[PDB]
């Protein structure tokens, strides 16, 4: 009886404005809203559907006790249809239950261990919620987890190659957990694709978030940060001065094995590195970052070989496999060939005398390709300054910044 | 970093090394530009996150 | 105002010097002389009207050969290097101050960059006009 | 050049599925295309993604993964032996020849770039046949050769607008 009256109220209220009262009723609940609604939802919204469908789905997913009978899959399909027929800017007026619905859907998918069906949902869910493509929403950390638990990295690339510029307030909620999870899962995704120059940046952004207490997610963002910095660079980069003081007082003593690993990877000695890896294998295997330390061990040899090029112009292979400790001229030859194939080094192998000759003549700065690169850097800097000016102009006109 | 030279073990000869000033100038300028862009984007993200009162309570 | 006719004629640039002086009592480089504390220097600038600008541009218009054969930035290399050195000193002073001058440094850098790009643009235009005809 | 369209078409075919798992032929074609484009990480993660049941259902995926493992270790001679060891269906048939041609070109480029003089045996193993490609190398591209030691010596092989935009940006 009352359900029909509420449905008619939402039907007559919508499509004629009066948005404030509308969102006022959506969150008025109604003590489970007579959960047997179900079927009439189909006639509640057609074509452009309506906004009450979001509330119906949210209250259906909010019980968290075997939500929608063993036929839940069918409802899943309906949700997909919703994602393809939501449309409009009106959903932006209710950016509080949409995020909760997406989180509940992802949690349900995870607990059934099928994190591939919902990948496509959280692309149109994100695309139809953010004001612009440079806005961080709470669903980014959710897609970055869905595409990471199940091995599928490419779909998340378009949302990780952009630079976040503003964060949606979502009219409440949005704790720091989502921000940290997004900037940690993006870092892991970038590490998986062997793109370290941006994985380091992602981990650095994750670490320097303001905090007052020790969190479970910052530990496994400094632990991996050390390894990524040891792989990409020859040392653990110093954190910037504006880092939160919690990491420098409590986080560091908690995980000291990686600091010792860096200390060993401060003086060139592969034997000590392998010995410390063997000794502290339980710590490195309890945190599940197995494989990222073998990369450091392998990169030590490449670093030593690269350092060899700053002193020598032509080195015998037998003599070369005595300072890097590769134990064999053939292994040194294959390592040098692999390094050349990746462009890390500039060398040539002469098999007549078994000698490696270093050229170190990358490029003279007269090729028009370098002019194109300089033009690209020009465009990026100009765009950055334009965004800076646009951001500043809003501040200059702010009603708060005229009183002082 | 006291002697700018390179050792050739095939003939056992120490050659002098001449630095190309233009190339190192261009490389240093490009590296500085990339570093500045990275720092600018980092601080802008910081300003985005320090305005919404994100402090990990 | 003090000018040097002989050096202006020989070098090719004017020697205009505008000077005001500190009055007696206020006490707070061999080229300037021996009374460098008593007198100081000032910057010089020029202006011309709209009619004067039009007349000067139309009179200087009978210089086309030198106009499109000057190939600047190859004659003022010393001036540009000195400008960049002064830019570095001003940037260092502004950085020390931050620990305004930054606006002045930005304006000077903008002026030098504008001059350099103007020279490059004239060179590009000359190359397009002369070297791209008859294959 | 036509393979890129097939690549992204297979990509959006993979992205959504009625039950999250697609047919064996499309999985195999996508894995083979990943192997062809010399992108090893995505192929390895795709292999990790495949459920064990469908993975063991078809042996074609096993051969594709064997080829991928051979190419991951950068062991050039074994790639040619393991690519033709088994039989390939028509759906994956035009992938093997393109992959072999790409591998041959990559080996040629690597030999020409990273080597100044290489034993003819190793170069011939890299390219594929130690009979007639040596004479082809010396004659066609003029590579120097010497007998006895069997030594080859390969050798390595719209404007004003931007300026006015820069000036306008600087002046403002």
From Swiss-Prot, chain A:
The keyword Kinase does not apply. Coiled coil: none annotated. Component of the COP9 signalosome complex (CSN), a complex involved in various cellular and developmental processes. The CSN complex is an essential regulator of the ubiquitin (Ubl) conjugation pathway by mediating the deneddylation of the cullin subunits of SCF-type E3 ligase complexes, leading to decrease the Ubl ligase activity of SCF-type complexes such as SCF, CSA or DDB2. The complex is also involved in phosphorylation of p53/TP53, c-jun/JUN, IkappaBalpha/NFKBIA, ITPK1 and IRF8/ICSBP, possibly via its association with CK2 and PKD kinases. One of its GO terms (biological process) is ubiquitin-dependent protein catabolic process. Its main location: cytoplasm. This is COP9 signalosome complex subunit 3. InterPro entries: COP9_N, CSN3, CSN3_C, PCI_dom, WH_DNA-bd_sf. Belongs to the CSN3 family. The keyword Phosphoprotein applies. Amplified and overexpressed in some osteosarcomas (OS), suggesting that it may participate in TP53 degradation in OS. Residues 195-363 form the PCI domain. GO terms for cellular component: COP9 signalosome; cytoplasm; cytosol; nucleoplasm; nucleus; perinuclear region of cytoplasm. Keywords: Acetylation, Cytoplasm, Nucleus, Phosphoprotein, Signalosome. It is found in: Cytoplasm; Nucleus. It comes from Homo sapiens (Human). Widely expressed. Expressed at high level in heart and skeletal muscle.
Curated annotation (Swiss-Prot), chain B:
It is found in: Cytoplasm; Nucleus. Widely expressed. It comes from the Eukaryota. Component of the CSN complex, composed of COPS1/GPS1, COPS2, COPS3, COPS4, COPS5, COPS6, COPS7 (COPS7A or COPS7B), COPS8 and COPS9 isoform 1. In the complex, it probably interacts directly with COPS2, COPS3, COPS4 and COPS5. Interacts directly with inositol kinase ITPK1. Interacts with CAPN8. Interacts with USP48. Interacts with ASB4; this interaction negatively regulates GPS1. Belongs to the CSN1 family. The PCI domain is necessary and sufficient for the interactions with other CSN subunits of the complex. Mediates the interaction with CAPN8. The N-terminal part (1-216), which is not required for deneddylating activity and CSN complex formation, is nevertheless essential for other aspects of CSN complex function, such as repression of c-fos/FOS expression. This is COP9 signalosome complex subunit 1. It comes from Homo sapiens. The gene is GPS1.
From Swiss-Prot, chain C:
Disulfide bonds: none annotated. GO terms for biological process: exosomal secretion; negative regulation of apoptotic process; positive regulation of DNA-binding transcription factor activity; positive regulation of transcription by RNA polymerase II; post-translational protein modification; protein deneddylation; protein neddylation; proteolysis. It is found in: Cytoplasm, Cytosol; Nucleus; Cytoplasm, Perinuclear region; Cytoplasmic vesicle, Secretory vesicle, Synaptic vesicle. Keywords: Acetylation, Cytoplasm, Cytoplasmic vesicle, Hydrolase, Metal-binding, Metalloprotease, Nucleus, Protease, Signalosome, Synapse, Zinc. Coiled coil: none annotated. Component of the CSN complex, composed of COPS1/GPS1, COPS2, COPS3, COPS4, COPS5, COPS6, COPS7 (COPS7A or COPS7B), COPS8 and COPS9 isoform 1. In the complex, it probably interacts directly with COPS1, COPS2, COPS4, COPS6 and COPS7 (COPS7A or COPS7B) and COPS9 isoform 1. Interacts with COPS9 isoform 2. The CSN complex interacts with the BRISC complex. Also exists as monomeric form. Interacts with TP53, MIF, JUN, UCHL1, NCOA1, HIF1A, CDKN1B, BCL3, GFER, PGR, LHCGR, SMAD4, SMAD7, ID1, ID3, ITGB2 and TOP2A. Part of a complex consisting of RANBP9, Ran, DYRK1B and COPS5. Interacts with IFIT3. This is COP9 signalosome complex subunit 5. It comes from Homo sapiens (Human).
Curated annotation (Swiss-Prot), chain D:
It comes from the Eukaryota. Keywords: Cytoplasm, Nucleus, Phosphoprotein, Signalosome. Signal peptide: none annotated. Residues 1-157 form the PCI domain. InterPro entries: COP9_CSN8, CSN8_PSD8_EIF3K, PCI_dom. One of its GO terms (cellular component) is COP9 signalosome. Its main location: cytoplasm. One of its GO terms (biological process) is protein deneddylation. It is found in: Cytoplasm; Nucleus. Component of the CSN complex, composed of COPS1/GPS1, COPS2, COPS3, COPS4, COPS5, COPS6, COPS7 (COPS7A or COPS7B), COPS8 and COPS9 isoform 1. In the complex, it probably interacts directly with COPS3, COPS4 and COPS7 (COPS7A or COPS7B). Belongs to the CSN8 family. Component of the COP9 signalosome complex (CSN), a complex involved in various cellular and developmental processes. The CSN complex is an essential regulator of the ubiquitin (Ubl) conjugation pathway by mediating the deneddylation of the cullin subunits of SCF-type E3 ligase complexes, leading to decrease the Ubl ligase activity of SCF-type complexes such as SCF, CSA or DDB2. The complex is also involved in phosphorylation of p53/TP53, c-jun/JUN, IkappaBalpha/NFKBIA, ITPK1 and IRF8/ICSBP, possibly via its association with CK2 and PKD kinases. This is COP9 signalosome complex subunit 8.
